[PDB]
A paper describes a structure:
Here we investigated the aminopeptidase, P. aeruginosa aminopeptidase (PaAP) from P. aeruginosa, which is highly abundant in the biofilm matrix. PaAP contains an M28 Zn peptidase domain (residues 44–116 and 274–510) and a PA domain (residues 117–273).
The PA domain was also captured in an alternative conformation in the truncated construct, PaAP_TE340A(trunc). These observations imply that the PA domain becomes free to rotate when not locked into an inactive conformation by the C-terminus interaction. The interaction of the C-terminus with an adjacent PA domain aids crystal packing, the protomers are linked together, akin to a chain.
Author numbering: 46 to 516
Write the structure that this text describes.
């Protein structure tokens, strides 16, 4: 298993990829979570420690490593917010019924007189409340600005309040029609720079408050917000044809709620062990590995990588394999539906070939499997938009296992594939080691097979004729 002959072959690499080594790496990832507040979310020290770990492992194995940074504004709500009247009479208002956060607000604990700003009430109003600087013409600094929705963005309103000396901002719904009087999920924008907290209230509350002389509100907004950057970790073999790159990826960040050991520690740790084993391989085609950042924020890291590649470099990538959640405790054996056989949506030419390879491996291991939707749910998405052939594995998340699936893969019908999905309890004990083992083996077989010959993809591309041959 030391020798390069074993790890270079599609049946040898799975035998050399031990589930127990992946679990050791998973335990390392969970230790990183425990040592940095129980999560590995983007722009947290948990993710910084994950990057350091991935990078030093890849270097120790002999890779030149790129830690690719890209700008990222982190906003994680930490707990429920509070709103209380202190003057004239004490009144505690109900969270998610009277008021909610503006997404991308700053944190704060502010008790101040409330001053309404350019209010235009009534059914059918066309309010310009706080949209202009003159609306704050006599606004006493230190106050909480009571502002009505209308015309302009919430960001513009709150930043005007901040430039006026406001301690905090309460935006209530416009109320120009009957169903515009309640709470909504709204945003001050990723570009908000007001520095002060902003919450959202119902219309009837906003009216009452504007009509209360001497009103003072105590306002507690309990979030993390940080304009910063985060990282992708990219490394490729020094061996291999650089014009025919086989690329694998797994996103390395977690949600803020938990350690994210299955989502997506499983893909990351499996891919890392495979990369260490391939350090000593003899591929025909160059293998590139990426651990993506800020994926739980909307595929930001992988999208950044792909969009910021020179065209000359992007045409060199032949296939992308995505491994996101492959240790689900109530697992099924799901393969991306590259040919559209199940859901009618096809990948770029070559994706059906990749799918057939994954199908072949599960068949060889005496295992059933089936398709899963590929409508841009994970980090292959910008690869899809670029016309690059792709595929990947999935063991299931918040969907419920069917009876047919229960008799195919074991586990419990009627229960989620991963009941700890995006939760605090997504830790080391949430991994099904049979699922992890078999999907790591499948990852290995297909990666290695493509590392020896992309012909099945080349053939599909040639039959498509939509991207002629350049060499
Ligand atoms: Mg105005
Ligand atoms: Zn995921
Ligand atoms: Zn996720
Ligand atoms: Zn299919």
């Amino acid at each position: 298993c030391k020798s390069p002959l074993l790890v270079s072959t599609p049946l040898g690499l799975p035998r050399c990829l031990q589930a127990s080594n992946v679990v050791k790496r998973l335990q390392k990832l969970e230790d990183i979570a425990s040592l940095n507040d129980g999560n590995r979310a983007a722009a947290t020290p948990g993710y910084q420690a994950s990057v350091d770990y991935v990078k030093q492992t890849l270097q120790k194995a002999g890779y030149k490593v790129s830690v690719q940074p890209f700008p990222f504004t982190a906003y994680y709500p930490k707990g429920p917010g509070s709103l209380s009247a202190t003057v004239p009479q004490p009144v505690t208002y109900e969270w998610e019924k009277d008021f909610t956060y503006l997404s991308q607000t700053e944190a704060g604990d502010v008790t101040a007189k409330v001053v309404p700003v350019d209010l235009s009430l009534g059914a059918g109003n066309t309010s310009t409340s706080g949209c202009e600087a003159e609306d704050f013409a006599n606004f006493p600094a230190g106050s909480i600005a009571l502002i009505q929705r209308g015309t302009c963005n919430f960001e513009q309103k709150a930043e005007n309040a901040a430039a006026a000396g406001a301690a905090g901002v309460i935006i209530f719904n416009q109320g120009n029609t009957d169903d515009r009087k309640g709470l909504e999920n709204v945003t001050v924008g990723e570009s908000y720079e007001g520095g002060i907290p902003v919450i959202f209230a119902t219309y009837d509350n906003g009216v009452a408050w504007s009509q209360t002389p001497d009103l003072q509100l105590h306002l507690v907004v309990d979030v993390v917000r940080k304009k910063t950057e985060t990282y992708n970790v990219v490394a490729e073999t020094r061996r291999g044809n650089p014009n025919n790159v086989v690329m694998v990826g797994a996103h390395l960040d977690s949600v803020f709620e938990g350690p994210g050991i299955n989502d997506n520690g499983s893909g990351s740790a499996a891919q890392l062990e495979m990369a260490v084993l391939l350090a000593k391989a003899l591929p025909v085609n160059k293998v590139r590995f990426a651990w993506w950042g800020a994926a739980e924020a909307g595929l930001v890291g992988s999208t950044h990588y792909v969009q910021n590649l020179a065209p000359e470099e992007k045409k060199k990538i032949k296939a992308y394999l995505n491994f996101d959640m492959i240790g689900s405790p109530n697992f099924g054996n799901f393969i991306y539906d590259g040919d559209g056989s199940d859901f009618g949506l096809q990948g770029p030419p070559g994706s059906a070939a990749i799918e057939r390879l994954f199908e072949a491996y599960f068949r060889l291991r005496g295992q059933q499997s089936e398709g899963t939707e590929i409508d841009f749910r994970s980090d292959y998405a910008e690869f899809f938009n670029s016309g690059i052939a792709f595929g990947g594995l999935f063991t299931g998340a918040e969907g419920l296992k069917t009876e047919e699936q229960a008799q195919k893969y074991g586990g419990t019908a009627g229960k989620a594939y991963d009941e700890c999905y995006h939760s605090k309890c997504d830790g080391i004990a949430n991994i099904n080691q049979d699922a992890l083992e078999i999907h790591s083996d499948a990852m290995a077989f297909v990666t290695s097979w493509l590392s020896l010959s992309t012909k099945v993809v080349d053939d599909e591309i040639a039959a498509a004729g939509q991207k002629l041959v350049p060499r």
